[PDB]
Symmetry: C3
Subunit: 435 residues, 3 copies
């Protein structure tokens, strides 16, 4: 009755679970002691000059790394705000999560249209948000005096959502003293010890035994000395939980989905923040965040290209989700409540994309015979010409109302008439439906 | 003056020590905290349906593994007898060995005809029966408050017997949470950690330094990550104790004897219990155990085929040896006191085996020129025809009395006349002696 | 801005730092708890019968190893002086360094002409002379209650000298119980554990972070399991401290200089004691030590052949340097104050060596155009014929005074007249200077 064996050839048998492929949209949570200072220079996105990136790091979870660079703006801010005698470690005692309600979060992610949730159980600073027995630097012994991963796991599952775990396998600044100043530094500033490979193995195993997560989401690769451990760990995981899944940031020959942070025959997932960082950043306002309209557009783009969206939320150290983020999540969810059928459970079509003469981008998703045509915007006119597309027969109709639409092939293109009556009832995106 | 070097080519120089080849018969002791419950379903022997084996495990030392399977009869028995809130670990506090006398055991094994003794210093549950400094889960800090391995080592040696050690290198359930339900589970449900490879190395070394055992008997393979350590450990062992020996369950290119648990040019050893399990089992009665006659027959069969017999004894948690087991050991010893010369110090002949027309099995052993003919039973008649055997000359005579016997070759066969007078003085086995 | 990458091909880019090549002469310090007994049989030098070497070990730092051999003279001396119930470990409590002044040492090494200093931070007995967090068996928690490595680092640097560290990577008798009796024993009597490879990595790293030494001087190889760690550790070291250096006793493809303990195109270094041992030995008198004259002769010989001299000092457990050693260091320094220009900052010539008809050895060093001719002794005569050497033109003159000397080529040889007036002002060595 155990199906999976501990070797890569055997672990290939485990394909991406249907629930994940159908889920389309999940929530990432970067929440730690780094949330307490919750500070970073909001420079930009990947592809900002990577030479200065670590010196002007827009990722607020990297606070400790930035704090270790004395030249950095983070060091100035830390000394000015907390003093030079305040070690990063001490944020664990200020990290109280006093106003945290896990069910409010789970409900928020549900209403946002999210189908799975993945919190940082341990990020690069090595602080663990569960009562792990392999370090005392955890949320049960320090600040919150509470198993944050567990109580969130109960909340997300009770809300009917899948629960995955993020674990920083590659980096752990409890095991190094120097900061990362350039990308090349990452090739040698790592724990490197056999001890650490055991520590990571033991910890992810502990996560598996305690919470049996639906996703194992690893960050920054797996320690070279422990890479062979993963075939034992995957087999173990899958045999306990066949519908479990695993990302592609381990550095070994197996993964269930690829990740991207900037039509394919494999399942993948785009991850990004609502803002510029993953962890809470005070300095971010609306100018640094995507709008409800842009989130929708992104989500539709990714789904049409075969991917999920893993949108990150960065809560404050008190356990509340900033109104700027909550606002955008509820907006996305309001579009999903309305157009979900065109997203959830869909498949890629023969092409991802097309455009009008007016310049409006178009994205396609499939649901057996039903082909959704999702416009990235609402054309201000009845006559709509789609460039380079033909339809041989059948019935094209307006998705939201169900009203039949007149259409015909004009050479390479396809003309469709959509009455203003119908275009005016749509929100953010005109959606059509063919057969 | 150090002969052995730490590489497999060099360690091949160490052949099986003469004492072991000459010893023929040794005692295994499976004794732990698992002895306290001392319970298992007495299903059968290896080759019972291996699909159900772990679910209906007849090995009482596997109690914890069986306890971890909630479906199992062991789980029912544990809850009913000790409660669900009684963790396996707590048997260490009930394991008092209150009536243990190590010299009574040593004397018992001596009278049984045993030439060496091998107790479980640490089995799969990871409880160590010596004051090891690498774990507190040992017999010095817990229940017995006593170095059981050491005090037994003194007793066995004072009785004039060789003392080996059993160590579970392959399995240690202090390092895993899941049970073994199928054989395939063993390929991934292991400690797996570098930590554990160090732990096993350090522990066997500690055994070597403290007790310098005559046999290193490993169980369930050696951790893959520590396999290279063994060439250092063997060289070390042999250089301290050249007459030391090592079994073949390490998974590396060197061994002094092979083990079997169901005419060869290498030394080997058959191991089995007096009953169906190795550890004490309450549920076993005489119907589940070999008789004195069967033990003799086994011992003779194995010795004629070049092997030793490692017969297992399973003591109670109070440190007493059940009368059913003691009875059979004393019976074997009574046959050995009588026919020892035909077993101890012997060698394989040109063939192991033969049979009479009446169907009685025959086994041969050699002692230079003296060829022992051991019948598996006592024929009820003077005229005895051995199928397919000839003797060219010399003098065949009755072993116990020394009386010359008349014989001749009849075609393929050999006829021997053994007067009822002599057949009636033998016990269990007619033994003859040729030249 | 990080130049070095963690692979051997990339680490070859780091050549020996100029300061080291120019330094020529450094001081080794073997100082530990072994200094307290400070005892060894002064047998001889390497190339003494190596069969008896460990049994009659002249290296006083090996006391514990010798103590573990019950046959040895060290065992007799220990029992007689301290009792059989006095474990080697307890010397850590007698090792008080009560009269230690680090600035007196630094000043002593400065006046001796030494340009760098390398103390044993941890030798084979595993006692660390700094407040390491990876073992309590250190100088901060035990005897001296003081960071000896650190306070010496401050003293040497304030005196203007470079400070390196010696670390015993290969051997650590905190991790083994058996002694080394023969050289072959070293191939298996080692820590061997993954644990230990981590321990050594972590400890040298800690040295790098705390003191950023100018030399990493490893002893007895690097643990096989940790050898790959060194490319990460070297890159790390070099990127923090490009002028750092590394010796060749790691057993990996990279080193900055070779070591010797008995004309090459690579930089190397001869290491030896003033006496026969490295650690303090009571039993050594002047008969076992080199004279000021011999030290000079050695230093000149090594420098002419492209090497540095790493002369060892062995202090008492009270932190004082024996007068026999201090005397010889001050003597060497008095010659260096006088002839330094001919040694410091020099380069190898087209040949190392030559000789007179009278049998006096000669050594050459180069300083651009200035070619120093250093006689190993002072000829008692004006006419000096150097065998097999010609000079085409230029001006040969007496180094100390600057007085021009008459000379000519006579066949293969070169005759030089040096007035008694000038030969009588030299000390230990006649030095000439050509162009
Ligand atoms: C989700 C995100 O992952 C990591 O970010 C990394 C980028 O995604 C990218 O792979 C580059 C190469 O490295 C980035 N690391 N940084 N900064 C985490 O580091 C990050 O904290 C966050 O968890
Ligand atoms: C002596 C005996 O050894 C192990 O038993 C194993 C069998 O001998 C056989 O090798 C199969 C493949 O695995 C058995 N394990 N089980 N159950 C120990 O497991 C057993 O406890 C005992 O020590
Ligand atoms: C400096 C010196 O190094 C080691 O001595 C070793 C010799 O230099 C040589 O390499 C031989 C092969 O092994 C010697 N070891 N011994 N004895 C150290 O062992 C010694 O203590 C000292 O540090």
């Amino acid at each position: 009755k155990p199906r999976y064996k501990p070797d890569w050839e055997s672990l290939r048998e485990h394909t991406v679970p249907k629930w994940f492929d159908k889920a389309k949209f999940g929530i990432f949570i970067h929440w730690g002691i780094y949330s307490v200072p919750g500070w970073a220079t909001p420079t930009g996105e990947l592809g900002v000059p990577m030479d200065a990136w670590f010196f002007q790091n827009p990722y607020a979870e990297w606070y400790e790394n930035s704090l270790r660079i004395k030249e950095s703006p983070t060091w100035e801010y830390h000394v000015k705000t907390y003093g030079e005698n305040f070690e990063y470690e001490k944020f664990a005692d200020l990290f109280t999560a006093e106003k945290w309600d896990p069910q409010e979060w789970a409900d928020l992610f549900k209403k946002a249209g999210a189908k799975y949730v993945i919190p940082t159980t341990k990020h690069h600073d090595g602080f663990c948000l569960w009562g792990t027995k392999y370090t005392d630097f955890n949320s049960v012994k320090r600040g919150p005096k509470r198993d944050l991963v567990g109580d969130l796991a109960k909340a997300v599952r009770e809300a009917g959502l899948r629960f995955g775990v993020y674990y920083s396998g590659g980096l752990d600044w409890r095991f190094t003293t120097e900061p990362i100043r350039y990308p090349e530094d990452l090739s040698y500033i790592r724990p490197n010890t056999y001890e650490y490979a055991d520590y990571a193995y033991k910890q992810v195993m502990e996560l598996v035994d305690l919470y049996l997560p639906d996703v194992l989401w690893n960050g920054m690769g797996w320690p070279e000395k422990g890479k062979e451990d993963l075939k034992y760990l995957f087999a173990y995981y899958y045999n306990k939980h066949p519908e479990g899944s695993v990302n592609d940031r381990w550095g070994v020959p197996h993964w269930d989905f690829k990740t991207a942070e900037y039509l394919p025959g494999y399942k993948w997932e785009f991850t990004r923040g609502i803002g510029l960082s993953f962890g809470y950043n005070r300095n971010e306002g609306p100018e640094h965040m995507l709008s409800v309209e842009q989130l929708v557009y992104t989500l539709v783009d990714v789904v049409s290209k075969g991917g999920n969206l893993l949108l990150n939320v960065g809560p404050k150290g008190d356990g509340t989700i900033p109104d700027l983020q909550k606002e955008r999540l509820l907006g996305l969810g309001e579009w999903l409540r309305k157009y979900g059928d065109a997203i959830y459970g869909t498949s890629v079509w023969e092409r991802c994309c097309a455009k009008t003469e007016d310049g409006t981008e178009i994205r396609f998703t499939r649901k057996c015979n039903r082909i959704f045509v999702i416009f990235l915007g609402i054309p201000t006119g009845e006559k709509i010409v789609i460039e380079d597309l033909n339809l041989s027969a059948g019935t094209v109709r307006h998705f939201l109302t169900g009203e039949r639409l007149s259409f015909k092939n004009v050479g390479k293109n396809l003309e469709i008439t959509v009455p203003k009556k119908l275009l005016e009832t749509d929100s953010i995106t005109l959606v059509l439906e063919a057969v």
